């Protein structure tokens, strides 16, 4: 038999024998670090039990499965291997995802007293990976530090492909039911960029009501041109709020937060504040796009013309049992 079981914490990992001494380490599953004798590199193994028994979850697990193979990019996590220990459909149960092992996730990095070199370089890689996703037709809409993992050389990778509860990093046009274009992901990048700076969540709403309130509390009531763009019932809910003028970005992110040591740092701080003011905009029409973000003086020292400019590479609802077989078929390559 080609598998063997190890227990790690609450979980028992039954994997191919190629993966050795599993040890503990998100996401929508349970995860172990492991050694891969076949490739001779450490890997992460995520376990997905009965992924088909939650409709929403099944669709997303199927998607993350076919896309994660469809996509290839240095800043997206790619599927090294997928397998199931069960040998028949009737008994099919667990899916195991193997990815390359990283050294931390972004929430852990965010906590460091980070400088602009590291900070902009991570953001470069985020925008860079976002841009790619976009050129494939994937618009994420659900980016958050927890689904981002980085190595100790600061190389970065987005772990998932988002939408078709943490609401903190969701764009306004998402939580409000408006259409969206590419830069709907720019919002998220900015809630993160601003979070490396305060070290705290920008818009930590207790719920979806208090979400919007943490937002227009700091940025101010959107202009009528924006409100005109809401559905009649959504307006009234969003209108009726307390009207705010918002705060200037030197106020939302005072010099206190950045390492304004000397000229370089001072300049780099204001640039960061400038980018933040272009990314953290409520109206998608006034919000910066991914490219100009990459070309921003806070970011562009990282711009590698080839690494970016380069060769550019559904949806139904199912019964649980049709998900199970659909997901099963996929794992059977
Ligand atoms: O903290 C980490 N590694 C350090 C570590 C801890 C214990 C043992 C070895 C290494 C770490 C790795 C990862 C990771 N690397 N590749 C994939 C992942 C990953 C973890 C959880 C969920 C997904 Cl979808 C992917 C996330 N955090």
Coordinates of C-alpha atoms and ligand atoms in Angstrom, one line a residue:
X1 CA 0.0 0.0 0.0
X2 CA 1.2 3.4 -1.0
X3 CA -0.1 5.5 1.9
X4 CA 0.4 5.6 5.7
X5 CA -1.2 7.6 8.5
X6 CA 0.4 10.0 10.9
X7 CA -1.4 11.9 13.7
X8 CA -0.8 15.6 14.0
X9 CA -2.8 17.4 16.7
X10 CA -6.5 16.8 16.3
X11 CA -5.9 15.5 12.9
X12 CA -4.7 12.2 11.3
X13 CA -2.9 12.7 7.9
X14 CA -3.0 9.7 5.6
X15 CA -0.6 10.5 2.7
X16 CA 1.5 8.9 0.0
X17 CA 4.7 7.4 1.5
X18 CA 6.8 9.9 -0.5
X19 CA 5.9 12.6 2.1
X20 CA 7.9 12.1 5.3
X21 CA 8.0 13.2 8.9
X22 CA 4.9 15.4 8.8
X23 CA 4.8 18.1 11.4
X24 CA 2.2 20.8 12.3
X25 CA 2.1 24.4 10.9
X26 CA -5.8 28.7 7.6
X27 CA -7.1 27.8 5.3
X28 CA -10.4 26.1 4.5
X29 CA -8.6 23.0 5.7
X30 CA -6.0 21.5 8.0
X31 CA -2.3 21.8 7.1
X32 CA 1.0 20.0 7.7
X33 CA 4.6 20.7 6.7
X34 CA 6.3 17.6 5.2
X35 CA 9.4 16.4 3.4
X36 CA 9.0 15.1 -0.2
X37 CA 11.6 12.5 -1.0
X38 CA 10.5 12.4 -4.6
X39 CA 11.1 16.1 -5.4
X40 CA 13.6 16.4 -2.5
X41 CA 11.9 19.6 -1.2
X42 CA 9.7 20.4 1.8
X43 CA 6.0 20.9 1.1
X44 CA 2.8 21.9 2.7
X45 CA -0.1 19.4 2.7
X46 CA -3.6 20.8 3.2
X47 CA -6.4 18.3 4.0
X48 CA -9.9 18.8 2.7
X49 CA -12.4 16.5 4.4
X50 CA -15.9 16.1 2.8
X51 CA -15.4 19.3 0.7
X52 CA -18.6 18.4 -1.1
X53 CA -20.9 18.5 1.9
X54 CA -21.2 22.3 1.9
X55 CA -22.6 23.7 -1.4
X56 CA -20.7 27.0 -1.2
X57 CA -17.6 25.2 -0.1
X58 CA -17.8 22.5 -2.7
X59 CA -17.9 25.0 -5.6
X60 CA -14.9 26.9 -4.2
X61 CA -12.9 23.8 -3.6
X62 CA -13.5 22.6 -7.2
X63 CA -12.6 26.0 -8.5
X64 CA -9.4 26.4 -6.4
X65 CA -8.6 23.0 -7.8
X66 CA -8.9 23.5 -11.5
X67 CA -7.6 27.1 -11.4
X68 CA -4.6 26.4 -9.1
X69 CA -3.4 24.1 -11.9
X70 CA -4.6 26.4 -14.7
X71 CA -2.6 29.2 -13.3
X72 CA 1.2 29.5 -13.0
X73 CA 3.0 32.5 -11.6
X74 CA 5.7 33.2 -9.1
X75 CA 3.4 35.0 -6.8
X76 CA 0.5 32.6 -6.8
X77 CA 0.6 29.3 -4.9
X78 CA 0.6 26.4 -7.4
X79 CA -0.5 22.8 -6.9
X80 CA 2.5 20.4 -6.7
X81 CA 0.2 17.4 -6.2
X82 CA -3.3 16.3 -5.4
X83 CA -4.4 12.9 -4.1
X84 CA -7.0 11.0 -2.2
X85 CA -6.4 7.9 0.0
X86 CA -9.9 6.5 -0.6
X87 CA -10.1 4.2 -3.6
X88 CA -13.8 4.4 -4.7
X89 CA -16.4 7.1 -5.2
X90 CA -18.7 5.7 -2.5
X91 CA -15.9 5.9 0.0
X92 CA -14.2 9.0 -1.4
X93 CA -13.7 11.4 1.5
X94 CA -10.4 13.4 1.8
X95 CA -8.5 15.5 -0.7
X96 CA -4.9 16.5 0.1
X97 CA -3.3 19.5 -1.5
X98 CA 0.5 19.7 -1.8
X99 CA 2.1 23.1 -2.2
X100 CA 5.6 24.3 -1.8
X101 CA 6.4 25.1 1.9
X102 CA 6.6 28.8 2.9
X103 CA 8.0 30.2 6.1
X104 CA 5.1 32.5 7.3
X105 CA 1.8 34.0 6.4
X106 CA 1.2 37.8 6.0
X107 CA -0.5 38.4 9.3
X108 CA 2.7 37.3 11.0
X109 CA 4.8 39.6 8.8
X110 CA 2.4 42.5 9.3
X111 CA 3.4 42.5 13.0
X112 CA 7.1 43.3 12.4
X113 CA 8.3 46.8 12.5
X114 CA 8.7 46.9 8.8
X115 CA 10.7 49.2 6.7
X116 CA 9.8 50.6 3.2
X117 CA 12.1 48.2 1.3
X118 CA 10.5 45.1 2.6
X119 CA 7.0 46.7 2.7
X120 CA 6.9 48.0 -0.8
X121 CA 8.5 44.7 -2.1
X122 CA 5.7 42.6 -0.6
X123 CA 3.1 45.0 -2.1
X124 CA 4.9 44.8 -5.4
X125 CA 4.5 41.1 -5.4
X126 CA 0.8 41.3 -4.5
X127 CA 0.0 43.8 -7.2
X128 CA 2.1 41.6 -9.5
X129 CA 0.2 38.5 -8.7
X130 CA -3.1 40.3 -8.8
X131 CA -2.3 41.6 -12.2
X132 CA -1.6 38.1 -13.4
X133 CA -4.9 36.7 -12.0
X134 CA -6.6 39.6 -13.9
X135 CA -5.0 38.8 -17.2
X136 CA -6.5 35.3 -16.8
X137 CA -10.0 36.5 -16.2
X138 CA -9.7 36.0 -12.4
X139 CA -10.8 38.9 -10.3
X140 CA -10.2 37.9 -6.7
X141 CA -12.3 40.2 -4.6
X142 CA -11.4 38.4 -1.3
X143 CA -7.7 39.1 -0.6
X144 CA -6.6 39.1 3.0
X145 CA -3.2 38.7 4.8
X146 CA -4.2 35.3 6.0
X147 CA -4.4 33.9 2.5
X148 CA -1.0 35.3 1.7
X149 CA 2.2 33.5 2.6
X150 CA 5.8 34.6 2.2
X151 CA 9.2 33.0 2.4
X152 CA 12.0 34.4 4.6
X153 CA 13.6 36.1 1.6
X154 CA 10.3 38.0 1.5
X155 CA 9.1 36.2 -1.7
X156 CA 5.3 36.3 -1.6
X157 CA 2.3 34.2 -2.8
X158 CA -1.4 34.5 -2.8
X159 CA -3.0 31.3 -1.7
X160 CA -6.5 31.4 -3.2
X161 CA -8.6 32.8 -6.0
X162 CA -11.4 34.4 -4.0
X163 CA -15.0 34.8 -5.0
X164 CA -17.3 33.8 -7.9
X165 CA -16.7 35.9 8.2
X166 CA -14.0 38.5 7.8
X167 CA -15.4 41.4 5.8
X168 CA -12.5 43.7 6.6
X169 CA -10.7 43.8 3.2
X170 CA -13.8 43.6 0.9
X171 CA -14.2 46.5 -1.4
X172 CA -17.3 48.8 -0.9
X173 CA -18.8 47.8 -4.3
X174 CA -18.6 44.2 -3.1
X175 CA -20.3 44.6 0.3
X176 CA -22.8 46.9 -1.4
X177 CA -23.8 44.8 -4.4
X178 CA -22.4 47.0 -7.1
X179 CA -20.7 45.9 -10.3
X180 CA -16.9 45.8 -10.2
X181 CA -13.8 46.0 -12.5
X182 CA -10.2 45.0 -12.0
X183 CA -9.3 47.5 -9.3
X184 CA -11.8 46.1 -6.9
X185 CA -8.7 44.2 -5.7
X186 CA -6.9 47.5 -5.2
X187 CA -9.1 48.2 -2.2
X188 CA -8.0 45.1 -0.5
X189 CA -4.3 45.7 -1.2
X190 CA -4.7 49.1 0.5
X191 CA -6.5 47.8 3.7
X192 CA -3.4 45.6 3.9
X193 CA -0.9 48.3 3.1
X194 CA -2.5 50.5 5.7
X195 CA -2.4 47.6 8.2
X196 CA 1.3 47.0 7.9
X197 CA 1.4 50.7 9.0
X198 CA -1.0 50.9 11.9
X199 CA -0.3 47.3 12.7
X200 CA -4.1 47.1 13.2
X201 CA -7.1 46.3 11.0
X202 CA -8.4 49.4 9.3
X203 CA -12.1 48.6 9.1
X204 CA -12.8 46.0 11.8
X205 CA -16.5 46.0 11.8
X206 CA -18.4 43.8 14.3
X207 CA -20.6 43.0 11.3
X208 CA -21.7 44.2 7.9
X209 CA -23.4 47.3 9.4
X210 CA -20.4 48.3 11.5
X211 CA -18.2 47.5 8.5
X212 CA -19.4 50.4 6.4
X213 CA -19.3 52.6 9.5
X214 CA -15.6 52.0 10.2
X215 CA -15.1 52.9 6.5
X216 CA -17.0 56.2 6.0
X217 CA -15.9 57.1 9.5
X218 CA -12.4 57.5 8.2
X219 CA -12.9 58.3 4.5
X220 CA -16.1 60.3 4.7
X221 CA -19.5 59.9 3.0
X222 CA -19.0 59.0 -0.7
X223 CA -20.1 61.6 -3.2
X224 CA -23.6 61.6 -4.8
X225 CA -22.1 60.4 -8.1
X226 CA -21.3 57.2 -6.1
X227 CA -24.6 57.0 -4.3
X228 CA -26.4 57.4 -7.6
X229 CA -24.7 54.1 -8.5
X230 CA -26.4 52.1 -5.7
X231 CA -29.6 50.1 -6.0
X232 CA -32.6 52.1 -4.7
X233 CA -32.8 50.1 -1.4
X234 CA -29.1 50.1 -0.9
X235 CA -28.9 53.8 -1.1
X236 CA -31.3 54.5 1.8
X237 CA -29.4 52.1 4.1
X238 CA -26.1 53.8 3.1
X239 CA -27.5 57.3 3.0
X240 CA -29.2 57.3 6.4
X241 CA -25.9 56.8 8.1
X242 CA -24.2 59.7 9.9
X243 CA -22.6 62.0 7.4
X244 CA -18.8 62.2 7.7
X245 CA -16.2 64.5 6.1
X246 CA -13.6 61.9 6.7
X247 CA -9.9 62.5 7.7
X248 CA -7.0 63.7 5.7
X249 CA -4.5 60.8 4.9
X250 CA -1.8 62.5 7.0
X251 CA -4.3 62.1 9.8
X252 CA -5.4 58.5 9.0
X253 CA -1.7 57.6 8.8
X254 CA 0.3 60.2 10.7
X255 CA 4.1 60.5 10.3
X256 CA 4.2 58.8 13.7
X257 CA 3.6 55.5 12.0
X258 CA 6.3 55.6 9.4
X259 CA 10.1 55.6 10.0
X260 CA 10.6 59.2 9.0
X261 CA 14.2 59.1 10.0
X262 CA 15.8 61.2 7.2
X263 CA 15.1 62.4 3.7
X264 CA 14.6 59.0 2.1
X265 CA 12.2 57.8 4.8
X266 CA 10.4 61.1 4.8
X267 CA 9.9 61.1 1.1
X268 CA 9.0 57.3 1.2
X269 CA 6.4 58.0 3.9
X270 CA 4.5 60.6 1.9
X271 CA 4.7 58.4 -1.2
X272 CA 3.2 55.5 0.9
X273 CA 0.5 57.9 2.1
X274 CA -0.1 59.0 -1.5
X275 CA -0.5 55.4 -2.7
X276 CA -2.8 54.7 0.2
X277 CA -4.9 57.7 -0.8
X278 CA -5.3 56.3 -4.3
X279 CA -5.9 52.7 -3.4
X280 CA -8.2 53.4 -0.4
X281 CA -10.9 55.2 -2.4
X282 CA -14.6 54.3 -2.0
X283 CA -15.6 55.0 -5.6
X284 CA -14.1 52.5 -8.1
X285 CA -14.1 55.3 -10.6
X286 CA -11.7 57.4 -8.6
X287 CA -9.6 54.5 -7.4
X288 CA -6.1 53.7 -8.8
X289 CA -5.7 50.6 -11.0
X290 CA -3.1 47.9 -10.7
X291 CA -0.7 49.1 -13.4
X292 CA -0.3 52.7 -12.2
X293 CA 0.0 51.2 -8.7
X294 CA 3.0 49.2 -10.0
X295 CA 4.4 52.4 -11.5
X296 CA 3.9 54.4 -8.3
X297 CA 7.2 55.9 -6.9
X298 CA 6.6 53.8 -3.7
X299 CA 6.6 50.7 -5.8
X300 CA 8.3 51.0 -9.1
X301 CA 11.9 50.5 -7.9
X302 CA 10.8 46.8 -7.9
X303 CA 9.3 46.9 -11.4
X304 CA 10.9 44.2 -13.6
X305 CA 9.6 44.8 -17.2
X306 CA 9.7 41.1 -18.2
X307 CA 8.4 39.7 -14.9
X308 CA 5.3 41.8 -15.4
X309 CA 4.8 42.5 -19.1
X310 CA 4.7 39.0 -20.4
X311 CA 2.6 36.2 -22.1
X312 CA -1.1 36.2 -20.9
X313 CA -2.5 32.7 -20.3
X314 CA -18.3 28.1 -16.3
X315 CA -20.1 28.3 -12.9
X316 CA -23.1 26.0 -12.2
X317 CA -24.8 24.8 -9.1
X318 CA -24.8 21.1 -8.0
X319 CA -26.2 18.4 -5.7
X320 CA -23.9 17.3 -3.0
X321 CA -23.4 13.9 -4.7
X322 CA -22.7 15.6 -8.1
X323 CA -20.1 17.8 -6.4
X324 CA -18.5 14.7 -4.8
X325 CA -18.1 13.0 -8.1
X326 CA -17.1 16.2 -9.9
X327 CA -14.4 16.8 -7.3
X328 CA -13.5 13.1 -7.3
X329 CA -13.0 13.1 -11.0
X330 CA -10.8 16.2 -10.8
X331 CA -8.5 14.5 -8.2
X332 CA -8.3 11.5 -10.5
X333 CA -6.7 14.0 -13.0
Ligands
LIG1 O1 4.3 29.2 9.0 C1 4.5 28.5 8.0 N1 5.7 27.8 7.9 C2 6.7 27.7 8.9 C3 6.8 26.4 9.5 C4 6.0 26.0 10.6 C5 6.1 24.7 11.2 C6 6.9 23.7 10.5 C7 7.6 24.1 9.4 C8 7.6 25.4 8.8 C9 3.6 28.5 6.9 C10 3.7 27.8 5.7 C11 2.5 28.0 5.0 C12 2.3 27.4 3.6 N2 3.3 27.2 2.8 N3 2.8 26.6 1.6 C13 1.5 26.5 1.7 C14 1.1 27.0 2.9 C15 -0.4 27.0 3.3 C16 -0.8 26.9 4.7 C17 -2.1 27.0 5.0 C18 -3.1 27.0 4.0 C19 -2.8 27.0 2.7 CL1 -4.0 27.1 1.4 C20 -1.4 27.0 2.3 C21 1.7 28.9 5.7 N4 2.4 29.2 6.8

